[PDB]
């Protein structure tokens, strides 16, 4: 069983203690190949890349000709808090925004579970809390591509809640940035017992949103 | 410590299959649409088994860092139940929405669940070694507004519904109606003879009473 | 019950990796397209070991209750062989398509598996305490008609395919045809310097007989 | 050399409206869709009138310099007829597909043509010094297979026609068949009081008979 | 022959003397139907709705039913200076934010001309300024949707350059407002006499802006 | 009355019998930004511009914050008969400018439009109307993420002098361009009579045998 971490900070993350750690990397989002993306679960080993590059894949036609950085594709990142940059930051100075992740070879399985609550869900019965967190469910930018996470993978629980929780990549370019199309979508909190059926509009400003985020925890047998 | 999650695809909570636990119950979220794109959560996974539902249960934040809650047009999709479409055919809101989402449980199990499909009317054995936990059809992919959609985890539980609907799912909107709207397409497994392998699929449209002769079985097995 | 799919990309059954027990075989099933929307299986689940193959496996159905098969316009697109296209460059239908075809198998392991990626030319070795059950190049995502398409988790055996193709996909149609088209594009992950992580990359074009060079290599291994 | 096209949505010839002349008659071509990308043509306009049909009008090349004709999986789309939809609700092939298709007429006019929109259920008259071709209902897009589509620009006569039809037109296929499909979308402009302009939408869903109750109507006119 | 001019403000233009108006309404940018995006050349008449809505169109199926605001669609619309408000705005708040326009009958038809420079492009030679104004080129907002202008077209010469030209309603909740992902496309103006095969890139800050967008003018004959 | 006509060569085309040179520059096919194709007629003033750039437009958001060729858009023209480089590798800089095209924006007495025949035969003017040019039924096309754009069949657009399996070429606001592998090309196809209402014939054509499987187009001007 391999228990994945992303720090969201430039360093990389501690296995728990008595976990081997199998390696340490970059947190991949997803690539975005002839417009079309294809996310890696941030739950699991595939969204922790050892090396990094804006420009991490190639790709070829039937033709027998490949082509490596030579179009228009791009690649995304979990980032971390550094400041959103005034213009693309390129290639030594993207290395602050770039979150670290670490792959730990775990006794058990793990899992995230949601509150769509302020409060903060249970583990279940006979299972420990490794972090608590933000429910992250999906992410959009360039176009309408983007991807979402599984609410069972501990991909989908942010300790850190982060309105933009991703930077993207150029490719050929080099560099990354931060544009307005980026999106990040949350659980939201729900008043009711159970079900809402007409939910009320609302705008919420820098302060009075974590408030409204689901909570969870990611929880390991044991 | 492996999970298995079941759809009652009616108003009644789903029991846990023989030799699991339950975890908790909730609502059948088949996938979500923000920003015109869908994001599903396997059937097979906890993560289509919602404690609370909500004909918008998420929001987006923007580089801004404003977050917009239920203001634009985006969707979420449920599994739903046999309740007649209303004739008016119009939005269904508020608790009157109630009656048409389908329960789930997610259950803790002793080893794991898989699927398999026989692609024929015949229900595909389980392999050995491993129990039967339900018989059902083939459910492979949707899609609704905008052609946008999701699908299933051939291997996944949540691709074997143990009830066959043509409709099995409902379209919710941030403004908190929901509906059944004409481009609603469910996508199963069709069924294949030995000879029809390696011919030009014979093409057939099927109405009430052989629709479920068509879509191929399955079969949902836990290995213990 | 931990299980690994195996895809031979020819026309003959994989066979299972040391440590590991036969369940079945079949056709290797990449994706398929209804209503225009690609629908993956993932290349290291058993969703993508179809024992019967067909251009059309799937149909679909309205709120109406009427469904249809190979009714429309939908793909299907699998793991091909080393066949060559044909001479006119013309569609392939019926039993000529069989060659085309790539078999898979789909075995029991005693732990799990995984895939893991060097991102240079060398195989990167197996985490300490797993062992090998194949080698190969790192394949990500594809894509075809209207850039639709699908890709692979980078921990899947998915995602380590053990022979190289610039074309490794066939795509077919309901109506019994399947073909290469030039805008059928296979993604892999590219071979990065260590000292170029955080340097503007440098562009390549390869051509036959030097393809391989800026492809990834992997192996899948197993937990002992 | 103004012109002037005008559609029939059945199978017979529409005729020139007074004061027109005409070029040539033809089918009525809505949109084509190729590699899953969908390209249509003003219905107002030549392009929207093919003296020749086929389920699959046109073919592809690519930097190989080879060509491939019906043979990947494209469409075609047509205005229709009344002409109902087969008990069978199966595909429609060969000559079973001519009563589907609408036909049309390319006419040069003496002036400008243009379409002006009520946004009522009343006809709106034509601007001054404007005479009247013909009255209708306001199309002004549609969608079908992956959602695709295209639509009418509103001052170009293709947003006029004259028969409104929840289903005016139909899907055809490379592989020779057409039919029509539950997500085959058209798209009207609604009627608005003035009083709502600015106020929310009040939502509506018609049935049989009560359709029209919200279509907005036109009418084409030249100088 | 009909020349269109969009005021971009919420007071319709007037048009030019000697030309009568046929009439006035608002400036209708596209429509939104099952997240496809459906155009109207700002340069031809179709632009100009006499009457506005949230919900200017409905949709019906091949089953005999049509629905009006039933679902999830919207439209799209030329903006005014009116702020950019921190929530959407509804109903009466609405009519400050739409730009209006007017459709003048004329005698002969009008053309944009664009000159990819700081310096701005002449008429023909026999031809008259009707007004100077922007390349603008395209748009896109929710999703990928969006579209763009003709450049021959008096629609891609706005007089008024605006970062975000146009606002979004959405439909059915009666409610228009100006989100993140809303772009503007324009022409650049070029430093190269007439080649650029090497782009040097940029980012412009409000203040340095216009000097960088592509001057037009629409002309008409005599 | 404008009619813009393209060389699909680096020689500007001359203005056709009858019309009058208003400029020249280079052939605009369409341009995609932020995943959007959008294009401009062929047949019009706008799909010729007088400078030439692989990113000839920027972006602005609501932020009031505009960004050049600092993201991964596109930019596509016609192209010319200049070979593609044996290394298939992307062409930068002025070594661009070879497979450019030119073209010309002329002043016209009367309006324009293009007639098609749907067979190999030039389908002649109507009566009243001359000849400026013919060439082949060009309908639409595809490239990076499937996207494109298309040609009002009635527009001269619609109409190409010189057949092309690769009638374009892509280009970055990396300052790069090249032709790639899923860049398609839309043209009508023949049809015979017996034709129209029968399952098309799937066909694959090869060099030498492409031209003649093309819809022919003539394109003319009221006089
Ligand atoms: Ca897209
Ligand atoms: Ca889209
Ligand atoms: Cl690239
Ligand atoms: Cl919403
Ligand atoms: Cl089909
Ligand atoms: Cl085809
Ligand atoms: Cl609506
Ligand atoms: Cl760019
Ligand atoms: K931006
Ligand atoms: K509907
Ligand atoms: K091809
Ligand atoms: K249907
Ligand atoms: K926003
Ligand atoms: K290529």
Not at chain 2, 28 to 45: F, K, M
Not at chain 2, 82 to 101: C, D, L, Q
Request: glycine letters at 8%.
């Amino acid at each position: 069983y391999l228990l994945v971490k992303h720090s969201q900070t430039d360093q990389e993350p501690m296995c728990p203690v008595g976990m081997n750690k199998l390696w340490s990397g970059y947190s991949l989002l997803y690539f975005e190949g002839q417009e079309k993306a294809h996310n890696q679960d941030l739950g699991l080993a595939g969204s922790c890349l050892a090396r990094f590059s804006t420009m991490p894949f190639l790709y070829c036609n039937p033709g027998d000709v490949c082509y490596y950085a030579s179009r228009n594709d791009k690649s995304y990142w979990l980032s971390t808090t550094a400041p959103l940059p005034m213009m693309p930051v390129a290639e030594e100075d993207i290395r602050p925004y770039i979150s670290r992740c670490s792959v730990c070879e775990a006794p058990a399985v793990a899992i995230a579970v949601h509150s769509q609550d302020v409060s903060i869900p249970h583990c279940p019965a006979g299972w420990r809390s490794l972090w608590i967190g933000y429910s992250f469910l999906m992410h959009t930018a360039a176009g309408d591509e983007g991807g979402g996470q599984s609410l069972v993978s501990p991909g989908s629980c942010l300790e850190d809640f982060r309105a933009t929780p991703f930077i993207e990549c150029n490719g050929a370019r080099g560099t990354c940035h931060y544009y307005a199309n980026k999106y990040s979508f949350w659980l939201t909190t729900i008043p009711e017992q159970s079900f809402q059926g007409t939910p009320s509009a609302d705008t919420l400003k820098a302060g009075l949103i974590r408030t409204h985020i689901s909570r969870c925890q990611v929880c390991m047998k044991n | 410590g492996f999970l298995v999650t079941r759809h009652s695809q009616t108003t009644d909570d789903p029991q846990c299959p023989p030799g699991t636990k339950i975890l908790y119950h909730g609502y059948s979220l088949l996938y979500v649409q923000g920003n015109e794109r869908a994001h599903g959560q396997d059937l097979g996974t906890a993560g289509s088994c919602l404690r609370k539902f909500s004909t918008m249960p998420f929001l987006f934040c923007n580089i801004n860092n404003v977050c917009n809650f239920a203001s634009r047009n985006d969707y979420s999709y449920w599994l739903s139940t046999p309740e007649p479409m209303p004739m008016s055919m119009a939005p269904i809101t508020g608790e009157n929405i109630r009656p048409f989402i389908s329960r789930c449980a997610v259950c803790e199990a002793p080893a794991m669940v898989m699927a398999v499909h026989s692609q024929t009317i015949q229900i595909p054995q389980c392999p050995t070694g491993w129990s039967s936990l339900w018989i059902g059809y083939s459910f492979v992919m949707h899609t609704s507004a905008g052609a946008e959609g999701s699908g299933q985890a051939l291997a996944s539980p949540g691709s074997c519904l143990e009830e066959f609907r043509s409709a099995p799912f409902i379209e919710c909107h941030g403004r908190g109606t929901c509906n059944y709207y004409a481009n609603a397409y469910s996508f199963w497994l069709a069924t294949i003879e030995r000879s029809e392998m390696f011919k030009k699929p014979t093409p057939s449209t099927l109405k009430a009473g052989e629709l479920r002769t068509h879509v191929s079985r399955c079969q949902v097995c836990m290995r213990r």
